[PDB]
Amino acid sequence: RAKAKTRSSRAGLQFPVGRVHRLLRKGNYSERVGAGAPVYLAAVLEYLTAEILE
């Protein structure tokens, strides 16, 4: 077993990719969620958050 890296850290993100993936699966949005989707969405939430906080 390799030592674990957060999906956020591989994406270069502060926002939780894994939490976002989970919220997509459990939110009744579709039957299946691709691996990119929460990465993209997490990034967008970070960008907008950054912009308001700026």
Partner DNA sequence: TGTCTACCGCGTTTTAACCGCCACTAGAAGCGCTTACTAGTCTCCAGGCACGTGTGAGACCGGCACATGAAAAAAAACCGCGAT
Residues that bind DNA (CB under 7 A): 1, 3-4, 6, 8, 16, 19, 25, 32-36
Q: Is 1 in the site for K ion (CB under 5 A)?
A: no
Q: Is 31 in the site for Cl ion (CB under 5 A)?
A: no
- Exposed, middle or buried, 50 (CB in 10 Å: 0-12/13-18/19+)? exposed
Q: Which C-beta is closer to DNA: that of 9 or that of 48?
A: 9
Q: How far is CA 24 from the centre of its chain?
A: 10
CB-CB contact of 17 with 42 (8 Å): yes
Binding region for K ion (CB under 5 A): 28
